[PDB]
């Protein structure tokens, strides 16, 4: 039988989990509210990996990239998951600039 949707989802999750774990402590740059930057990593989220992976799959293009075994846009994913979950991140970040950086990264990975 061809791969089922459930089987493909498991494959995608294991690929995303691998890429996120591999770079879990890597510090990425995010826009502050004063024309500066702050550093953040997946380790700051204090979320279980499953919850991180489930939210990452929502970033458009990430499921396709993971299905294909291609590199995912990790800074964009982190920004998104942190925006959805982390109060400290919310207070540090300038949302309008975050939108632009996430879009720039994501457009630049999905083509």
């Amino acid at each position: 039988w061809s791969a089922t949707n459930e089987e493909d989802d498991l494959s995608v999750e294991a690929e995303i989990a691998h890429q996120i774990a591999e770079s879990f402590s890597k510090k990425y740059k995010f826009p502050s509210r004063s024309s500066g930057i702050f550093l953040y990593n997946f380790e700051q989220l204090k979320m279980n990996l499953d919850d991180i992976v489930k939210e990452a799959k929502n970033v458009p293009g990430v499921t396709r990239l993971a299905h294909d075994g291609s590199k995912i846009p990790l800074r964009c994913v982190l920004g998104w998951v942190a925006l959805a979950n982390s109060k400290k991140f919310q207070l540090l970040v300038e949302a309008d600039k975050l939108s632009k950086i996430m879009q720039d990264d994501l457009n630049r990975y999905t083509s």
Side-chain angles (χ1 to χ4, degrees), residues 14-33:
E15 179 69 48
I16 294 168
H18 155 60
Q19 290 193 42
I20 290 182
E22 175 180 65
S23 293
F24 211 72
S25 289
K26 179 161 178 66
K27 286 174 173 175
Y28 294 102
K29 294 182 171 189
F30 294 97
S32 81
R33 295 193 192 174

Side-chain angles (χ1 to χ4, degrees), residues 68-100:
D68 296 342
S70 299
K71 291 186 180 207
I72 72 179
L74 290 165
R75 179 177 58 181
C76 180
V77 167
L78 176 55
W80 180 257
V81 177
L83 179 64
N85 288 278
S86 173
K87 183 64 63 172
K88 178 170 78 166
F89 184 89
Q90 179 191 320
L91 299 188
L92 289 166
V93 78
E94 181 166 337
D96 70 280
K97 292 178 172 204
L98 184 69
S99 178
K100 181 177 181 298

